[PDB]
Amino acid sequence: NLEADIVIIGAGAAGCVLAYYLTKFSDLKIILLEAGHTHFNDPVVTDPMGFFGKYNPPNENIRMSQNPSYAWQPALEPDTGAYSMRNVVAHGLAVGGSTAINQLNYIVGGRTVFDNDWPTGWKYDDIKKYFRRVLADISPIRDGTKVNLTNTILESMRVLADQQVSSGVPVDFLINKATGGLPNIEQTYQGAPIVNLNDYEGINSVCGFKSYYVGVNQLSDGSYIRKYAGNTYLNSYYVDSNGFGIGKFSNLRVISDAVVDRIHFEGQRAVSVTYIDKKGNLHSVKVHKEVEICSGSFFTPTILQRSGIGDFSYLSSIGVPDLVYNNPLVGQGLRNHYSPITQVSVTGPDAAAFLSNTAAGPTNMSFRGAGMLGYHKLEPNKPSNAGSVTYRKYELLVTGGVAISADQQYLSGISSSTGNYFALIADDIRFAPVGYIKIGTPNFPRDTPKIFFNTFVNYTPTTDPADQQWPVAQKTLAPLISALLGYDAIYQIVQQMKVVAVNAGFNVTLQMAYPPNDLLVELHNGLNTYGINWWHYFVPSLVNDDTPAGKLFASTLSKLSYYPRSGAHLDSHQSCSCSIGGTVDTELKVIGVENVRVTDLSAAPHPPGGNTWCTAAMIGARATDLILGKPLVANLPPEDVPVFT
Amino acid sequence: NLEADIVIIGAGAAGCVLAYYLTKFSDLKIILLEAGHTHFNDPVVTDPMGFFGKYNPPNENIRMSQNPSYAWQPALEPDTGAYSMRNVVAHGLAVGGSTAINQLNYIVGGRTVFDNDWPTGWKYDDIKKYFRRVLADISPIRDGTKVNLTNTILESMRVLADQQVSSGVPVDFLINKATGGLPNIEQTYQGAPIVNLNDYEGINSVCGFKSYYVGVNQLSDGSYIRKYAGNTYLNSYYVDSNGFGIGKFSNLRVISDAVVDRIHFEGQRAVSVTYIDKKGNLHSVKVHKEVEICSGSFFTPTILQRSGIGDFSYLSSIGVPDLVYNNPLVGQGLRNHYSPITQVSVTGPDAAAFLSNTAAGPTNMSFRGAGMLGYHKLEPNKPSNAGSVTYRKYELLVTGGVAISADQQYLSGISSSTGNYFALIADDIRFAPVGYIKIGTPNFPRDTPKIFFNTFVNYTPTTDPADQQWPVAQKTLAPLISALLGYDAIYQIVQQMKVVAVNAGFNVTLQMAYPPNDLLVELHNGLNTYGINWWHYFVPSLVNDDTPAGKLFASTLSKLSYYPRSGAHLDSHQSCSCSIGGTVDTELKVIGVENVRVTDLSAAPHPPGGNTWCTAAMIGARATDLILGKPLVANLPPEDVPVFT
Numbered sequence A, B: 001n002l003e004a005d006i007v008i009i010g011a012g013a014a015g016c017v018l019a020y021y022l023t024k025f026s027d028l029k030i031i032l033l034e035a036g037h038t039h040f041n042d043p044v045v046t047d048p049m050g051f052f053g054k055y056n057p058p059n060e061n062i063r064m065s066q067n068p069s070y071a072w073q074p075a076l077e078p079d080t081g082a083y084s085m086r087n088v089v090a091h092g093l094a095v096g097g098s099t100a101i102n103q104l105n106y107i108v109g110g111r112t113v114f115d116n117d118w119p120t121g122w123k124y125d126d127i128k129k130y131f132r133r134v135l136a137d138i139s140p141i142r143d144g145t146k147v148n149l150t151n152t153i154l155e156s157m158r159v160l161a162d163q164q165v166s167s168g169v170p171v172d173f174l175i176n177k178a179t180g181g182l183p184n185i186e187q188t189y190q191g192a193p194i195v196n197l198n199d200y201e202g203i204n205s206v207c208g209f210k211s212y213y214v215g216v217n218q219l220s221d222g223s224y225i226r227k228y229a230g231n232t233y234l235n236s237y238y239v240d241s242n243g244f245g246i247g248k249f250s251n252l253r254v255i256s257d258a259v260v261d262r263i264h265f266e267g268q269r270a271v272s273v274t275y276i277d278k279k280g281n282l283h284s285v286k287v288h289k290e291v292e293i294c295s296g297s298f299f300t301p302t303i304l305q306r307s308g309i310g311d312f313s314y315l316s317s318i319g320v321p322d323l324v325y326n327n328p329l330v331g332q333g334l335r336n337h338y339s340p341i342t343q344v345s346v347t348g349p350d351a352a353a354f355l356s357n358t359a360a361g362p363t364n365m366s367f368r369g370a371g372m373l374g375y376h377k378l379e380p381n382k383p384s385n386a387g388s389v390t391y392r393k394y395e396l397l398v399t400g401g402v403a404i405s406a407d408q409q410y411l412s413g414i415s416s417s418t419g420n421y422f423a424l425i426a427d428d429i430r431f432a433p434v435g436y437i438k439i440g441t442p443n444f445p446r447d448t449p450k451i452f453f454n455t456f457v458n459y460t461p462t463t464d465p466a467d468q469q470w471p472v473a474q475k476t477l478a479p480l481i482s483a484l485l486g487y488d489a490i491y492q493i494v495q496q497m498k499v500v501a502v503n504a505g506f507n508v509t510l511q512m513a514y515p516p517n518d519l520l521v522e523l524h525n526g527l528n529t530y531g532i533n534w535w536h537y538f539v540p541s542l543v544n545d546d547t548p549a550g551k552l553f554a555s556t557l558s559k560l561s562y563y564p565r566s567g568a569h570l571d572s573h574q575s576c577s578c579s580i581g582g583t584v585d586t587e588l589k590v591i592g593v594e595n596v597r598v599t600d601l602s603a604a605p606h607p608p609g610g611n612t613w614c615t616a617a618m619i620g621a622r623a624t625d626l627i628l629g630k631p632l633v634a635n636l637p638p639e640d641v642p643v644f645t
């Protein structure tokens, strides 16, 4: 028997903060159901480099996100825009959730995304305190090793940002309007100050820096360890070995291996929750006040639909007997990021000194920069505010070795063994495609529901006059346009690096080796010779430009369209399944019911400006104050932090 | 309350026969738990062409094996031999199991596989009656439309089989030793008799025919319908709408949507089985005599391991509390088939007449032949009996259109729109690789367990002398050798077709367009100039043949090794997870327990000579007589068949 008045389902990035700070500041009885044990002893979780497979057995060399004993394994339906490939993108299965298996990065997101895309009450000035709270809770660190490649790249970026600042055009990709004429590029010399990307006031929307902030901490011995939600908020100092709380937190219960099925639900009010344990028995817990769903973006709409909230026609079709509320918007608007990869060759006799000091330590995890960039000059899909507000579009990442898939490694002829290649990535942060989630069987939580997500689709013309069917091709082709413009933005960095490396003491040469170089120079020339309407040549049957130059450009675009489909990576930043306004109101309460709330990343109405870990924790932190009634977390002094064991 | 003395889990190809003929011939109380409703009204299941997506909604065009509401969706761990790609291969989820979503083909398997690879009591003369039983139960039909391409191919096969019969070599791929000197190729002219591939006496181990036997039946209206296990054995004539039996079968209960978890198991004797229904409640059923597991190859070891039979150390590690029997061989020896694809171009002005009468009707489903072939002359991995017994190695299939993946369609430049291309496939029936299955969470039946299956791995040499490390490279390279020899066997058919099409009234030319033609002629020349030790050049660091010709051959082999990895298809013929001798004895009884048996395809000790649907039904049929005690099914007259509603 386990009656309690707050029941949280899932201890992820948001569940842990919620439980911890909700039992600290009140006397209600909190229950946390997670379905996964605590990996506080596993060397593959505590050690940061275990992310790269240092402790893997020889015969089962698979990463944690491919291990069914560490992660939920959802595979999406064939991708009609990527040659119908199905992708498996995972969720963490442990205390701490996906933060137990992630890359440990802290992009906070810009100021402008919250100011312009989130509803009132969620503007940036209303949430910055919670971001400060989560950052102070973790205390990330910076890179502990310098490298001259970062120097060369930073000089190149400032060199071309100088000419972008002039020329008067307003929406180039290195223009930050909160700083003014001077470029927002970190200085590169002895004793240079560090431009902080997650700054408090949100000044830096577009900036170039030399290091990220990764969530690890150094021990007195010398070893580094992971610092995740389950490490800080539910550790042996705050919770017993039996799951009971201790002292201040004695009003807290955590059940370890408890897979939750649905919400037994009297009238339109929640009254009980059932789950299954490792024994195989079914248990019921009684609810007095509130149910919180923090089960992740893929599996929150699933449990909501199984309970009875969703589309009545479909749910009746598959066989859900108990219907509650007819909201056909549950599980809509799924969003994600997407990172295409380019890689560059260095030609010379003694390039080793140029690529030295790049191996992955636990303080950077192979990230060496390099910045956040805004919209390209020639992208037609921009918000109207772009003239007066700087948005975040691309996240630039530089890494050693090759990062393409193994099949592409064979096909392109470039191998990971050689030592004159390095990778650049322009991750898309405002990715356009939208998908959705539905369940297929109303029995128990299934590992694979129906997930639909099509990215790089094409446009099939009609007999409509060309003048009035361009502005549907624009929307249908947005992602391909953005990926190609990212290719161009990376390409026009490398000759700047040529100049900088020449005048910094290096006899080296840099060229883009993947995709093929000529295929990129042709894109550069096509862009600068066709202007703002360059993208019309994606559909060659409407341009009516039958000249051989136009045919060349169209063929180049068609050939380039292959690379982002196959030689890229879909990220694991799922969100917005049950966003604000769609499924829940500003108070995180589900429409059509009076005592259930959803507070994980699946409630965000727009993805943040980068990696989506701070946002989920912030949502949980604000849910704490929403539930209790008055702001206690928002006013805690920053010197009060959870101690670590 | 549902006590009964026989409880079957899963109504697949073997569960339906077992339940039907076990309640017909006895008075025990039979219960069948399936976890899936009856699709007797769904047009996408009853109509054969619904397999190809005739009734699919426009926005969700996915086949039945990719639909989570029709199939279990297991994805295997990254394939170290295929550029680390994860493949999703499904199981049927309905009455009838995988036969509700399959291709409807009836390869029975040869005589020699059962005579040489299965234990005593399971030789061919001990089982042929049950194969006749299942075939008479279904009554498949042959192709209802002729085509001249089959004529040309059959002439070509007999032409080269004539010269293979001479030349005295004993193990070519068109030699059948049960017929003698004359070729075993169907005659090709007016009123020719039909050589039956599933013949009663098992004479035809290697034969060339013009049609397969697909499991459909024609109605009086004119429409064809699917004829599967759930259609024949559990239909409205034998089982009520409520799941009760009727009259003769009144001693039978079928529960529709019941997902089974584990076996509650007193002492070392089975006493109860628990399941979950669509309501979300957990039910228990009492067992008096027997439990049958017919849950498929992927999910039978899963339920056995969750119950408590398996490896104690690992099961304790993941958290199974109740341990029963320590058999570390549960879930070992997983086998499957594998089909690489080649495709051929026809060059000429009026090839349309040559490729006419090839569209897929419900009586062939785009299969137009062409035979079963034995070992190639130059394969080193052959059983010792191969001199005196003919084994089945390849299954040859001919089809219209292109059958490669969409990515390969783009890369190779060949498109499905054009009308001068057709596909050939040499499916490997004695596929060498072996994998295994383990569970990752002891809570509930998960859709994705750990499945390990690596196919086309490479050999890394050591400092061991070359003379005494060849016979480990042979075993490690068996699958690649077999695939390449299949490529060669297909290639040396097309010039025979050149001659036959010339002398049959056609001005057409045939050449292998995928893989590239020169890459195949070089393989042909390398084979005939390097002899039986041609495969030594897979590892170029040991041959010590530094001549440029040897370098050419090694490069050709390395380039050809890419095609079977990416341009092929893994089949859905899983088997042998709990085979005879490994997990169960000759009586299908699980070792370490006295009242549980497993009777689905996961009990086969060696895959059959072709498509694995007749074998599963045969196993169920023999289990019927094993359970009752005396042969009632083995002596039923062939004119007694289940009527159809």
Ligand SMILES: Cc1cc2nc3c(=O)[nH]c(=O)nc-3n(C[C@H](O)[C@H](O)[C@H](O)COP(=O)(O)OP(=O)(O)OC[C@H]3O[C@@H](n4cnc5c(N)ncnc54)[C@H](O)[C@@H]3O)c2cc1C
Binding pocket: A009, A010, A011, A012, A013, A014, A015, A033, A034, A035, A036, A065, A090, A091, A092, A093, A094, A095, A096, A097, A098, A099, A101, A102, A103, A104, A105, A106, A107, A258, A259, A260, A261, A294, A295, A296, A297, A299, A303, A445, A572, A573, A574, A600, A601, A602, A611, A612, A613, A614, A616
């Ligand atoms: C491969 C990978 C890489 C990542 N890289 C980064 C990165 O570079 N930067 C970054 O900032 N973030 C990264 N992340 C993390 C990710 O971006 C966010 O942290 C994530 O969205 C956190 O959201 P969440 O806490 O709401 O969900 P989760 O953390 O996934 O919470 C899910 C929790 O709910 C539980 N649960 C689910 N279903 C049930 C059920 N039926 N019953 C009971 N419990 C249930 C699960 O066990 C788990 O504890 C990565 C994640 C992965 C997997």
Ligand SMILES: Cc1cc2nc3c(=O)[nH]c(=O)nc-3n(C[C@H](O)[C@H](O)[C@H](O)COP(=O)(O)OP(=O)(O)OC[C@H]3O[C@@H](n4cnc5c(N)ncnc54)[C@H](O)[C@@H]3O)c2cc1C
Binding pocket: B009, B010, B011, B012, B013, B014, B015, B033, B034, B035, B036, B065, B090, B091, B092, B093, B094, B095, B096, B097, B098, B099, B101, B102, B103, B104, B105, B106, B107, B258, B259, B260, B261, B294, B295, B296, B297, B299, B303, B445, B572, B573, B574, B600, B601, B602, B611, B612, B613, B614, B616
């Ligand atoms: C895509 C595809 C193509 C195929 N093509 C061919 C072909 O060309 N030729 C051919 O001969 N065969 C074909 N097959 C069929 C296949 O080769 C065999 O018929 C199959 O191995 C049948 O084995 P089975 O009956 O033991 O397993 P299944 O038929 O898969 O039986 C599984 C049954 O167990 C049930 N079950 C599983 N787990 C549970 C659980 N926990 N609780 C309750 N019930 C459970 C499932 O609901 C299902 O009813 C194809 C199958 C597929 C999927």
